[PDB]
Design a protein around this ligand. Sequence first.
Ligand SMILES: O=P(O)(O)O[C@H]1[C@H](OP(=O)(O)O)[C@@H](OP(=O)(O)O)[C@H](OP(=O)(O)O)[C@@H](OP(=O)(O)O)[C@H]1OP(=O)(O)O
Ligand SMILES: Nc1ncnc2c1ncn2[C@@H]1O[C@H](COP(=O)(O)OP(=O)(O)O)[C@@H](O)[C@H]1O
Ligand SMILES: [Mn+2]
Length: 283
Amino acid sequence: PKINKIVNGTDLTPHYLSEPNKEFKIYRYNNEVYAVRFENDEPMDYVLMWKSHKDYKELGKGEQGTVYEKTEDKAMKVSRGRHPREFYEEINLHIIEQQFFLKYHGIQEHFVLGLWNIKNEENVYFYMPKINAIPINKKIDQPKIEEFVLALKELNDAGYWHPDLANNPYHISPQNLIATEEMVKTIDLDGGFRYDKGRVDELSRKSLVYGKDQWLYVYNFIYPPTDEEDHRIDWRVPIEKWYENNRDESLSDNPHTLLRFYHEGLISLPKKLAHDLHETILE
Ligand SMILES: O=P(O)(O)O[C@H]1[C@H](OP(=O)(O)O)[C@@H](OP(=O)(O)O)[C@H](OP(=O)(O)O)[C@@H](OP(=O)(O)O)[C@H]1OP(=O)(O)O
Ligand SMILES: Nc1ncnc2c1ncn2[C@@H]1O[C@H](COP(=O)(O)OP(=O)(O)O)[C@@H](O)[C@H]1O
Ligand SMILES: [Mn+2]
């Protein structure tokens, strides 16, 4: 019911996307900034981007930017890079499409996407919902991490992956996982998700394999398999040997591999995935 009301809001598209635009528009409607997509010259669907309140406080800093608190509900990242306006416009278009993917899979809440403001080409910044981190307990809050991992797997299964969360089985960036009251979210997505572009060099092919199994690396790093002696198993050894001997293939594309390794005690799996896989056999 809101689509026709949202398009009557304030059009912010020139501050984010190329103008004119046939496919996507940005509107502020009742203190909420939406992205609206079009088909056949008609508004079709929308996604929520952030809440609007239309020497900043520093929320944090990484290698490639500084994140400020624009409002109590919105964060603002200033990256160290220099690119043309069209570079950010293209990222924004892909982020909007990726936001729609997240909505259509019911996992938008687990990822903090946003848009690059480009109304000043020399003062570019990334708006996004501000989240509030709280303590992590691996046992008491295990469902939070489980639910995030399964959401990330849904992303990986579709060919998208986080650009800086778990690049390979030996690299994890836990700082990009944030626990809130209800769940775990992931940040540092101002470039959008990664995806394969059809390239066949060695690096690209390995990155695709690592990305599709990203969800597995995160889960096993936090909840590695345990043997009789309560000693953690190095899940990386069987997985690496598998990649070396099954070229250009991911474990996620082979559920029989996941179940076999899980049955042998080599890898861990979220409780619901183990249950679903085992239920697939009983039935
Ligand atoms: O009038 P605009 O050109 O559309 O810019 C406004 C303005 O931001 P700036 O003046 O700093 O550029 C608002 O800030 P206020 O002075 O009204 O407080 C801000 O609203 P927030 O307070 O929530 O930051 C809003 O941002 P939003 O997109 O969330 O509505 C943003 O609009 P633009 O996105 O078009 O820049
Ligand atoms: N949406 C957000 N809400 C609250 N804090 C954030 C948000 N995004 C980033 N931060 C803070 O800024 C820090 C740096 O974030 P960022 O630069 O995006 O990732 P990285 O440091 O991994 O490159 C984070 O560790 C976090 O504390
Ligand atoms: Mn950074």
